[PDB]
Structure 1
Amino acid sequence: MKYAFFLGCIMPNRYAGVEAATRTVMEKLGVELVDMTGASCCPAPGVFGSFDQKTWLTLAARNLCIAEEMGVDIVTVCNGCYGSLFEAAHLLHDNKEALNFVNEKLDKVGKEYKGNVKVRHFAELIYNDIGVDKIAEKVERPLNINVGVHYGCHFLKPTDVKHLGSAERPVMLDEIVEATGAKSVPYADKMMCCGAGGGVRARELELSLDMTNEKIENMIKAGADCTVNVCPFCHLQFDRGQIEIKEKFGKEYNFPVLHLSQLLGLAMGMDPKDLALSVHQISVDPLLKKI
């Protein structure tokens, strides 16, 4: 398996530890990860989909062309990029006037999208193509902790195009994190939004923190030692949001937050140092003690 590795923005430029975690974990499961040289913002659907839909799709198609000229499919570790690139690929697959509109724009930069790129989420790639048994085979250090799994919204939905099964009661991320030896705990309103998407974190911050605080509370009451996500936007909201929540509302939880690449990293015997856990706004060390 050879996949063009779309990086996005937050993971490469802020939470680089997730990138390090991903590069080794997926090499270890046996995926060659190619670089998309010159790939930009996907672009973030919340702001760019909200300002101009044509600009979102045109800039998204441009990143797809990078992979199509490479003769390779994209995999991403972020729901944000996954949603943006997947939905762009599908609409360009399905709507031929939208495809015409985009290539007349990309024609001015010597590009043309032809419909060959498939976009894959790394969690879904692991489940459907690699197998959850292959993660258990490589667990060097079992992680015997209770995990509050946060699927994020743009992973499973819209189900009518994602075709990743149920969005109401999914099992895909729970079985993945349970292959590391951890226990995914049920909690109230498990599938609810973290609050950050759709530009809401930037424009209505306290609204976003209200939803994040609800999620954290339900995880803690179900005995979660940390939360795990499949999106740097979720990561930032759970991690940085706890600082903001504390400064604005006055609650402190010090609830550790991990991206799935980091959690898999720990299972496969990676050095916490190369996971860049120190850059987390909330200390992971209470978690490191239990594992």
Structure 2
Amino acid sequence: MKYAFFLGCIMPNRYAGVEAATRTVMEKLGVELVDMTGASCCPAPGVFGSFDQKTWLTLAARNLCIAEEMGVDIVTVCNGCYGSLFEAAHLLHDNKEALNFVNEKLDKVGKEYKGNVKVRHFAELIYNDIGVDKIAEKVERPLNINVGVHYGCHFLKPTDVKHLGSAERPVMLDEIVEATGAKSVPYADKMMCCGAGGGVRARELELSLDMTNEKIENMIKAGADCTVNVCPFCHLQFDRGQIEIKEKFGKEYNFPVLHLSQLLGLAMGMDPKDLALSVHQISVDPLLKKI
């Protein structure tokens, strides 16, 4: 299994521990990660897709060409990047007018998308190709904690193009998290948005925090010890959002936020130092005393 690793922005430049965790976890599961030299912002669809669809797709196609030139598929650990590149790719394969538009612009740079790139999400790649059983085989330290699983919206949706099963009652992440020994607690409005998507975090911060607060509150009521996501954007919203909720509304939860690769990492027998948990706005130390 050889895949071009799209990093994005938030993971490599801020929550770099997610990158280290993914690198090791994917190596342990028989996956070779190749560098996408020159890869830029996916670009973030919240701003780019809302500002100009033409510019979002052209820059997304530019990044798809980098993996196409290498002759490998793409793998990402972000719903934002997954949604941006997967939907960009699907559109260039399905719509000839959109492909022709983009290629006229890409021709000015010396690139041309040909439609041979497949975009994968590591959680989906783990479930469908590798197998959940292979996760459990590599568990060195079983995690005896309750996890508030946050799928995020851009992982399974739009279902018409993603084809990763139901986005209403999914089981994918619940089984991957449970392989580590953790328990995926059912909580109210489990499939709702964290509130950051569509550039809402930046434009309407209070609105985004109201939704994050609802999710955190619901997870806590369900006995969750932490939250697990598959998106640095969700991660930032749950982690930094808690500081912003404390500052604006005075509500304190001290609810640890982890990316699935970091959770998997701990179970694989990784040193929490490599996971860069000290970079998190909300300390994960209380959770480390429970695992």
1:1-291 matches, cutoff 5 A:
1-291=1-291
- Deviation string 1:136-184 (CA, Å, 9 cap, x unpaired) is 0000000010000000000000000000000000000000000000000
> Post-superposition shift, 1:135?
0.2
- Deviation string 1:75-114 (CA, Å, 9 cap, x unpaired) is 0000000000000000001000100000000000000000
Q: Distance in 2 between matches of 1:69 and 1:173?
A: 32
- Deviation string 1:51-98 (CA, Å, 9 cap, x unpaired) is 000000000000000000000000000000000000000000100010
> Post-superposition shift, 1:24?
0.2
> Post-superposition shift, 1:43?
0.2
Q: Distance in 2 between matches of 1:19 and 1:281?
A: 18
> Post-superposition shift, 1:283?
0.4
> Post-superposition shift, 1:241?
0.1
Q: Distance in 2 between matches of 1:240 and 1:74?
A: 29
> Post-superposition shift, 1:20?
0.2
Pairwise CA RMSD: 0.3
> Post-superposition shift, 1:212?
0.1
Q: Distance in 2 between matches of 1:23 and 1:258?
A: 16
Q: Distance in 2 between matches of 1:289 and 1:104?
A: 56
> Post-superposition shift, 1:250?
0.3
- Deviation string 1:221-280 (CA, Å, 9 cap, x unpaired) is 000000000000000000000000000000000000000010000000000000000000
Following superposition, which runs of at least 4 residues in structure 1 exceed 4 angstroms of deviation?
none
> Post-superposition shift, 1:2?
0.1
- Deviation string 1:194-218 (CA, Å, 9 cap, x unpaired) is 0000000000000000000000000
Q: Distance in 2 between matches of 1:261 and 1:66?
A: 25
> Post-superposition shift, 1:32?
0.2
> Post-superposition shift, 1:50?
0.5
> Post-superposition shift, 1:117?
0.3
| Aligned residue pairs, count | 291
Q: Distance in 1 between matches of 2:87 and 2:57?
A: 9
SS at match of 1:275: coil
SS at match of 2:115: coil
Q: Distance in 2 between matches of 1:184 and 1:235?
A: 17
SS at match of 1:109: coil
Q: Distance in 2 between matches of 1:108 and 1:55?
A: 14
Q: Distance in 2 between matches of 1:191 and 1:257?
A: 17
TM-score, normalising length: structure 1: 1.00
Q: Distance in 1 between matches of 2:10 and 2:261?
A: 14
SS at match of 1:148: strand
Q: Distance in 2 between matches of 1:288 and 1:188?
A: 26
> Identity over aligned residues, as a percent?
100
